[PDB]
Amino acid sequence: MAENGDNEKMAALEAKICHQIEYYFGDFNLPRDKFLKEQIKLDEGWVPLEIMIKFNRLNRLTTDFNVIVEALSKSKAELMEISEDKTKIRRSPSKPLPEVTDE
């Protein structure tokens, strides 16, 4: 006995999580990412979703390591690269990142 909903909200939430990661890596933040530079410089460039799930930018949406990774792991998981545990994100060092134009 339950019949809660259709889990459709997760479908729209999956894209929202990928869009947030796109904000820091979407070529816009990389050209001026001070915090991202710290995670990428840390070691190997692999960043932990803790930085993403703790920042008000994304923490105000999913913040669920399992939900955040699942959405980006299969949706828009081609832009950057993800480790095997699916609990970290990094910018493709072998891929160029262009700056966005203003106005």
* String of DSSP letters for 6-39: -SHHHHHHHHHHHHHHHHHHSSSSGGG-HHHHHH
The 8-class DSSP code of residue 43 comes to S
Decide if 71 contacts 14 (C-beta within 8 A): yes
Spell 26-52 as b/e; 16+ CB within 10 A means b. Answer: eeebbeebeebeebbeeeebbbebebb
Structure determination method: NMR
The position carrying tokens 């710290």 is 38
Which domains are assigned to the chain? 1-103 (1.10.10.10)
What does each C-alpha distance from 13 to 20, 30, 66, 72, 74 come to in angstroms?
11, 24, 13, 11, 13
**How far is it, in rounded angstroms, from Cα 15 to Cα 85?**
20
- Whole-angstrom Cα distance, residue 69 to residue 72? 5
- Residue 9: Cβ within 10 Å count: 9
CB 17 within 8 A of CB 58: yes
Alpha carbons 52 and 71: distance in angstroms, whole number? 14
Q: What are the CA-CA distances from residue 39 to residues 20, 49, 58, 95 (Å)?
A: 17, 10, 16, 18
Q: What are phi and psi of 16, to 5 degrees?
A: -60, -40
Residue with token string 């699916």 = 86
Query: In Å, how far are 3, 26, 33 from 64, measured between CA atoms?
Result: 23, 21, 23
